[PDB]
Amino acid sequence: XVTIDADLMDAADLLEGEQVTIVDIDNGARLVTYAITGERGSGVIGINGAAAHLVHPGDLVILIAYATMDDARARTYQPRIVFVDAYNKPID
Amino acid sequence: XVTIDADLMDAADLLEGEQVTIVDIDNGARLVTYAITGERGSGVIGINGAAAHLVHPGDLVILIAYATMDDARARTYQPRIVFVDAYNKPI
């Protein structure tokens, strides 16, 4: 895979090659792949390769990354949650 | 995603944002998502977003969390198992 606008990767704290779960709100598909850095500020969310069978252009998706962390850190950790407009630009 | 009654989260030792596996007894669906804290004592089990395609209101579900632990602790660890009535209240 999934090409993500570098702005959304920074906003979401995702690295190139970090494991990502994609869930499709339109068809209910769920898959695991990895993040590729996309052209900054382009609003690109690009499905590459085998995933294109399951996730289609115009589908609304949720992109999720998880981390393993000790009990103490888990209770205090604040996850980076990025809401976006119809053009994939971050919102308040 | 899954909104869980804060009482069930405390009972089951789940944090907000902890990864949760939902298995559906009614339709056999199995998915991975994360826990959101629901109104305490409401008995809420709310499926949010894409998961709603697979897991439906009225379905009986099992919610499961796993942990990574060293060999030594794994052999002794006691999991928190929460039984609930038809209204999602602990027993």
Partner: peptide, 24 residues
């Protein structure tokens, strides 16, 4: 004892393209 926790979420993004035969 380590828990698996949500760290990142991009909520309701729109898929812009798909290429079955991508090389990269």
């Amino acid at each position: 004892m380590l828990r698996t926790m949500l760290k990142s979420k991009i909520h309701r993004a729109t898929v812009t393209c798909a290429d079955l035969h991508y090389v990269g």
